[PDB]
Design a protein around this ligand. Sequence first.
Ligand SMILES: C[C@H]1O[C@H](O[C@H]2[C@H](O)[C@@H](O)[C@@H](O)O[C@@H]2CO)[C@H](O)[C@@H](O)[C@@H]1N[C@H]1C=C(CO)[C@@H](O[C@H]2O[C@H](CO)[C@@H](O[C@H]3O[C@H](C)[C@@H](N[C@H]4C=C(CO)[C@@H](O)[C@H](O)[C@H]4O)[C@H](O)[C@H]3O)[C@H](O)[C@H]2O)[C@H](O)[C@H]1O
Ligand SMILES: C[C@H]1O[C@H](O[C@H]2[C@H](O)[C@@H](O)[C@@H](O[C@H]3[C@H](O)[C@@H](O)[C@H](O)O[C@@H]3CO)O[C@@H]2CO)[C@H](O)[C@@H](O)[C@@H]1N
Ligand SMILES: [Ca+2]
Ligand SMILES: [Cl-]
Length: 496
Amino acid sequence: QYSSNTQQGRTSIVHLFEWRWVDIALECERYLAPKGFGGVQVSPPNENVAIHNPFRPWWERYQPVSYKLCTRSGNEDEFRNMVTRCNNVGVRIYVDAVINHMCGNAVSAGTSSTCGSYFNPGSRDFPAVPYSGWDFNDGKCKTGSGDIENYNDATQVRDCRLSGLLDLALGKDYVRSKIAEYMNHLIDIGVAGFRIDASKHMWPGDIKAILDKLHNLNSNWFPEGSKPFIYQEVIDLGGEPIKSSDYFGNGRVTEFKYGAKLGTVIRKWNGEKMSYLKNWGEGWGFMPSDRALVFVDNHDNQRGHGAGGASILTFWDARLYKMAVGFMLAHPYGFTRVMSSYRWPRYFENGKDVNDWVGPPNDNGVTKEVTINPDTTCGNDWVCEHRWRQIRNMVNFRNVVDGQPFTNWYDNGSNQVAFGRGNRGFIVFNNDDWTFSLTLQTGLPAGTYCDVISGDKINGNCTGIKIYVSDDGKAHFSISNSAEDPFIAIHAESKL
Ligand SMILES: C[C@H]1O[C@H](O[C@H]2[C@H](O)[C@@H](O)[C@@H](O)O[C@@H]2CO)[C@H](O)[C@@H](O)[C@@H]1N[C@H]1C=C(CO)[C@@H](O[C@H]2O[C@H](CO)[C@@H](O[C@H]3O[C@H](C)[C@@H](N[C@H]4C=C(CO)[C@@H](O)[C@H](O)[C@H]4O)[C@H](O)[C@H]3O)[C@H](O)[C@H]2O)[C@H](O)[C@H]1O
Ligand SMILES: C[C@H]1O[C@H](O[C@H]2[C@H](O)[C@@H](O)[C@@H](O[C@H]3[C@H](O)[C@@H](O)[C@H](O)O[C@@H]3CO)O[C@@H]2CO)[C@H](O)[C@@H](O)[C@@H]1N
Ligand SMILES: [Ca+2]
Ligand SMILES: [Cl-]
């Protein structure tokens, strides 16, 4: 469960949050494959409650109605078409598996669902599965409300309803088997693994029992005996009885400390400085690099959900965001996930975004296609961070330097830093309030290199900045503090 199952030489996944299956299929072919992306995390592909108050929020997809592959992203045929087309060009699909719970206990009975299946939260009847009252934790939970009230009690975190979401009885073989049937359906289609939603809300042993039932990956695309890549969503910032390490037996775990701390560093908050990143990784108290699933923001915290945090960087703070993402993709720690978002009309009333619920760009609830602008950006309010030159090119940097050691670190004791990855890549940052101008040892072969942040290598020249590495590996770098992108990155494949 620890190996990504990506193609050799591809090292990141991108979250195409709320994208339609047909758009992802094209994106794999026209962009992700040629640009060297490892894979795509998809939004939950199973039927959910259609919520009209408020109007079709992104979070309705975290309220399952059945395991039918029928959502605003598309139907089963469209989902199958996407997985096949993506695998065929060497780009993997990872499914956001919502398996802790069905929908909210207070949702009205009927057929207000993305495939029109009947369901009755009140009587606990989900006949499309099927589940009944016997399949939920109502009698196991010991809180007065039946909901999670207190994270200091590890038992209720697992047995009670997360924000009222009907809590599946994951200790029952029947429940485990219905979940496994869903996941095996997905695996056999050709899915490479899973983001396990709400893992903290499940016993590690119950997840293990589900995982025991899972097939090996599809033998047309994957070597025999390949196991689904598992990364579990556990928000562990310290101070709670449940630890991310509790989940290491099942696969990787999201490291939410990563983006929280990096955000603070890059904003220069709380006295933090880029020079402190010399021991980034386990040195900062993070989990082992071989288990960490790392990211600057996720779909929750970019809009203040989950642990939130003021320090979280997103596309809304585009300048600092690119630097954070660039740092992450350069550094060997963890397995990297890049966010890809849509814009919503963010509106703050007393420090909180009252539109933090708004779903994907839509016309009357129908998800807008991702249109591709002439400059390769996206239209229809899709942000497409993964198509931003600075991030896209750093995705390739990580590929180029895969497995090379962290070396040749430099810092000015404040916010001007640089480091190399073996003899394959080198990156320089200026986050101070003055110019960085210095000659540095790069660790690279002599030559002319295109800076992949300001531009591209195209048939014998560069469209951005050029760096000249002399015979002894030294190169001069000048980065103004007023620079729109105050960082430079060069690597073996950007050499002329
Ligand atoms: C969002 C994450 O919450 C949890 O995280 C905890 C940390 O674990 C903890 O250490 C500390 O930092 O606080 C955090 C925030 O509380 C959780 O551990 C983590 O897994 C969550 N991320 C996940 C999981 C889910 C659930 O699948 C996703 O959640 C999102 O979707 C939810 C469901 O649609 C959405 O909730 C909405 O719907 C519920 C039903 C509603 N609840 C109300 C209803 C009733 C009726 O009984 C009352 O009981 C409640 O009090 C009402 O508020 C919510 O109000 C409504 O928003 C949720 O907001 C949304 O984040 C998430 O996307 C995953 O990534
Ligand atoms: C294990 C520890 O990791 C993190 O601590 C950071 C800290 O947030 C950061 O400011 C910095 O602290 C030192 C640094 O170690 C030292 O080399 C430098 O001279 O001075 C810095 C402070 O002025 O780095 C450490 C990691 O080395 C977490 O933030 C913390 O919660 C956790 N206990
Ligand atoms: Ca649970
Ligand atoms: Cl996540």
